[PDB]
Amino acid sequence: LRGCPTHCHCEPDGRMLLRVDCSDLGLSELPSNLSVFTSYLDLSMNNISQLLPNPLPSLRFLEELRLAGNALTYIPKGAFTGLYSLKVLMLQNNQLRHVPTEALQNLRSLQSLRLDANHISYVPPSCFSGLHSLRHLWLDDNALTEIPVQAFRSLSALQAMTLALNKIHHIPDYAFGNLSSLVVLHLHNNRIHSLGKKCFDGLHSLETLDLNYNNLDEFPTAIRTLSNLKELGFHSNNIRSIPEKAFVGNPSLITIHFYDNPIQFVGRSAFQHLPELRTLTLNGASQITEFPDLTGTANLESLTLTGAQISSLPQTVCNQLPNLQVLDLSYNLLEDLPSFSVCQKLQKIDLRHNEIYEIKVDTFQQLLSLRSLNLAWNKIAIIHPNAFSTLPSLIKLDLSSNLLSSFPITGLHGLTHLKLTGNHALQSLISSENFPELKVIEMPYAYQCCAFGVCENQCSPA
């Protein structure tokens, strides 16, 4: 060890470059004797009030400076002048109350800067001036109030930024103008109440946007301009409706999160043209009266839409839904049902608590992959015998509380689950044979259960 600050632990970076770990030494200030050739300096969790009695610039080889968990209150302007090789700077978990006014300027090689977990509330404009290499910026867990749009304009090389866990309440138009290269933007856990119609118009390269855990009152239409957007989150807000053609501006969207929003209405065309979208979930949108249009977005694999007032389905609804595997339209007002035959690859169906009165023949024909079918709590007065004739993979079936009187045994032999409770008019018996492999049975009458080996003196009717 030569030049490796006494008490600290050093190491070779590239050959003859020096990496110095003086972390968790509880130093009052940093050591005076520090070898140039240092390419990595870690000073973390070290109660460091000020820099310095003797600060050490001229370490032109310094690649990475870590200054976290230190009690710094400010940064002098000439502090980092020597460092021509600085790529990453870490200044988190300090009591900084504003971005260093000039101290950070013209670090030409600086690539990633962490200023999270401080008490910063003010960002002086052109504090980031001349940072041509800056790609990654942290400003979370701070006390910001507005977007420092002015200061952010110079950072045209930024690729990722976090303004999360602040107190930002509003986003002005063009608030991130010059940031053409930005790819990942995180605004979650703020108090964002309102945002402009052109507030995201700058960043064309943006792929992911996090607006989650905020206080938004309406859908963010600025979204329109983000053509390369891939992942979008604005859940846990107070939004009430999704407008027609809401995501028209953003094909190649893959994941969308808008849960924990009291969404009541959704436009029918709102989810059109998203070919890479795989799953759609819409719970408790009471004000939806029609099935949504899904033109140019046929690659849905899981569609669930419940708690609405949907009266009926387009008869060629399945034409829009190949690749669909699970379909859950429970708790609506459905009476008649389309063919569903076109919707192969369907494995699961949940149509409970609808007002369905009849099950026709073709309404479940050629569903070879279908394994689970729930039609419980409908008002199904009659089922055509051959309705279930062509469902080889069917194993789970629930027809509970349907006002049935008889049953179609044809096909369906040896399914695993069968539920018939609440069909009080269903009184005739059913043999254990015609039905091996039943592991769960529900039946309106105890003796009908006994016919399967159960019935005490485990199902049951009762």
Binding site: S405, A425, Q427, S428, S431, Y447
Partner: protein, 104 residues
């Protein structure tokens, strides 16, 4: 299959009875076994339904034969019969007992 029975299983006996017959399910302990009768034995009563006519045991305290559940036809001797039910007493609406045990 069985006497006047349309479909049976080797294990459980008769599953389906001829048109106007009643099915009686008997516990041979453990297995249930289905018999097909022209009418139901004492203890049971005849119940007609459009899918299945069934013999139904009469769980009425001290009843011998009955009209349905909840109504006894002829009560156990040593007990007075009043409006399909069987009491020691027999009210008070104004009954009393003739040369019979059928509290008027």
């Amino acid at each position: 299959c069985a006497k006047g029975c349309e479909l049976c299983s080797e294990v459980n006996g008769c599953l389906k009875c001829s048109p106007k017959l009643f099915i009686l399910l008997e516990r041979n302990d453990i297995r249930q076994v289905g018999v097909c009768l022209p009418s139901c034995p004492p203890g049971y009563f005849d119940a007609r339904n459009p899918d299945m006519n069934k013999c139904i045991k009469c769980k009425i305290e001290h009843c011998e034969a009955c009209f349905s559940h909840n109504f006894c036809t002829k009560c156990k001797e040593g007990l007075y019969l009043h409006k399909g039910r069987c009491y020691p007493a027999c009210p008070e609406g104004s009954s009393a007992a003739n040369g019979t045990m059928e509290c008027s």
